[PDB]
Amino acid sequence: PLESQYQVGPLLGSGGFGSVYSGIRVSDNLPVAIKHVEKDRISDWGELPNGTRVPMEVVLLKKVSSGFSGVIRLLDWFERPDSFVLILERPEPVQDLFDFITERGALQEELARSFFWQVLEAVRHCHNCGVLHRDIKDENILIDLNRGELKLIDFGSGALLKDTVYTDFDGTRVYSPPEWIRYHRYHGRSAAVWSLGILLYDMVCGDIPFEHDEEIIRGQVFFRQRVSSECQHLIRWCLALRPSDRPTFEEIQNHPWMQDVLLPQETAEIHLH
Ligand SMILES: Cc1nc2cccc3c2nc1N[C@H](C)/C=C\C[C@H]1CNC(=O)c2cc-3[nH]c21
């Protein structure tokens, strides 16, 4: 079933998420990504409308799937005795934001604005679809280098969006909010805004602002690179200690630093080509 449909290429990466290979769909030569995840390594299980027991990740990807290119598209999935295999769309050429920032260092603010805006549109879409990502970070963002379009990947730490408190977390600790560190409690949207503040800092400074738990709890932001006052203000707002002091997504996108965003194509032409 999987063998007669897909042609497996080289390993793209492996980690907590599992193992992801490059691939081609034989029928139409479509570039794909083949993700393998061990059953033992999945703690978060979900159910389809069919009543079928699948990883939460599959549930969440189906819930976010549409013509919108800001989230990775799940094309197909398969169950093996000891693993689940996910077929994902693969943009070509592509590079993850972590690698991109590593190569460029700190991003120009115009470029950071375009990237951050697109991330915001992607996250808002997820929330509007009842999906919380819980792992927003540079490594989980792909850049379509031709089109200047960004894509959220890896919903393996995600959950159904709810208005009540989360007492579980499996994403990246250095992106997690002080209320998680201190109390093991957080709410979806406000935790997501914190991680977005970490991400934005990372874009404009070339690195994350905090490494240790004590740094997260203190939440004192030091800028190691030249960053405009407007951007600094937005970052500090997203990184407010009290979750209710953090901006809503609307407030972020209405912020003066976020005005006059480039289109993705304009972004690629100026910054990527
Ligand atoms: C180059 C590349 N293309 C991709 C296309 C579709 C989906 C993924 C993807 N990943 C890469 N490269 C990255 C660096 C490799 C592993 C990261 C891994 C992280 N978790 C995922 O679910 C996922 C999806 C893709 N990649 C991942």
From Swiss-Prot:
One of its GO terms (biological process) is apoptotic process. Its cofactor is Mg(2+). Keywords: Apoptosis, ATP-binding, Cell cycle, Cell membrane, Cytoplasm, Host-virus interaction, Kinase, Magnesium, Membrane, Metal-binding, Nucleotide-binding, Nucleus, Phosphoprotein, Proto-oncogene, Serine/threonine-protein kinase, Transferase, Ubl conjugation. Its EC number is 2.7.11.1. Autophosphorylated on both serine/threonine and tyrosine residues. Phosphorylated. Interaction with PPP2CA promotes dephosphorylation. Changing residue 161 to F: Decreased kinase activity. Induction: By interferon-gamma (IFNG). Strongly induced in leukocytes by the JAK/STAT pathway in response to cytokines. Induced by different cellular stresses, heat shock and cytotoxic agents. It comes from the Eukaryota. Expressed primarily in cells of the hematopoietic and germline lineages. Isoform 1 and isoform 2 are both expressed in prostate cancer cell lines. This is Serine/threonine-protein kinase pim-1. It comes from Homo sapiens.
